[PDB]
Amino acid sequence: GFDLGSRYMDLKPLGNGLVFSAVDNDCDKRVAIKKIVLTDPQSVKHALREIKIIRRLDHDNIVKVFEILGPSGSQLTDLTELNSVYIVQEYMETDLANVLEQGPLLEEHARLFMYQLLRGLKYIHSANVLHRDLKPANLFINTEDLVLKIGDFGLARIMDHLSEGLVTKWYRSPRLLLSPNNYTKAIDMWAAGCIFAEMLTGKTLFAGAHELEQMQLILESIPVVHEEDRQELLSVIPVYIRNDMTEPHKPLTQLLPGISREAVDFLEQILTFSPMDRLTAEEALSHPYMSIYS
Ligand SMILES: [Mg+2]
């Protein structure tokens, strides 16, 4: 119903209305608009890093950016003299989290979406861009075409007051839990493995409520095969978890009951404890299970 600037019309919020649907009046096309509130200098730094990363990305499996708007909704030409900025971008029908709320995918859909996620990751990793917040809610779906696009580069960095409690732990790799300051390509790949499993089952694979429970759940199901890893872990993790990892639990195959052997075998090459053993996005795309799409 509301106008933003001289160009965007019929703004309707898409609980938390900082994300709107709007019509671009120069084309009469539906777009998405994210309002970004510039509160602190830690909020200006997060806005600017996000804007720089998203501007440089054009790929079939990445949400397109159209425009950056200033507080009044007029276009920016290239800013801590500003209370707010808007990001105008491709309107997407839904996100993978909304899809998985209605149950698991057929393997054929999970596989096709995985092939798109990996193609998106190969691209952003080639630009040395780490996403750092891969989860179903940041994977946008057009259901008619079965197109998956990676969006919400809010937490993204060029590889080179935490709000820790607002970051979901479910898609975090063992190395990210042990070494929290350092994002890597391999950390994105671990999250893609967890998202593949969730598409197959409709359930979070490792649903820990904090870092420690997340590590416990991963150790219950994923073996530590390198001595170097085992020694680091033994010196960091508490007694009850160390006890728990010599107790019997379900392996990956039993967390994915009735899923084809080929899907589980592919997944076992992504959900390796060590990133040294883990398929890169490029290696994953060239694995037989995925090369059927190439
Ligand atoms: Mg999101």
Numbering used by the authors: 13 to 26, 30 to 93, 98 to 179, 187 to 320
Paper excerpt:
Thus, we determined the crystal structure of the kinase domain of this atypical MAPK. Overall, the kinase domain of ERK3 adopted the typical kinase topology, comprising the N-terminal lobe containing β-stands and the C-terminal lobe constructed mainly from helices. The two monomers in the asymmetric unit were observed to form a dimer in a head-to-tail, face-to-face fashion. However, we expected that this dimer was likely induced only in the crystals, as the kinase was observed to behave as a monomer in solution as determined by size exclusion chromatography. Detailed structural analyses revealed that, as expected for an unphosphorylated and ligand-free state, most parts of the activation loop and the glycine-rich loop (P-loop) of both ERK3 molecules in the asymmetric unit were disordered. Nevertheless, there were several features that displayed an active kinase conformation, including an “in” conformation of the tripeptide motif DFG (aspartate, phenylanaline, glycine), as well as the canonical salt bridge contact between the β3 K49 and E65 located in the αC helix. Detailed structural analyses further demonstrated high diversity of the residues of ERK3 and ERK2 within the ATP binding pockets that typically engage in inhibitor binding.
Extracellular signal-regulated kinase 3 (ERK3) is a poorly studied member of the mitogen-activated protein kinase (MAPK) family. Similar to ERK4, ERK7, and NLK, ERK3 is classified as an atypical MAPK. To contribute to recent global research efforts on untargeted human proteins, we present the crystal structure as well as the discovery of inhibitors of ERK3, providing a foundation for the development of selective inhibitors for this poorly-studied, atypical MAPK kinase.
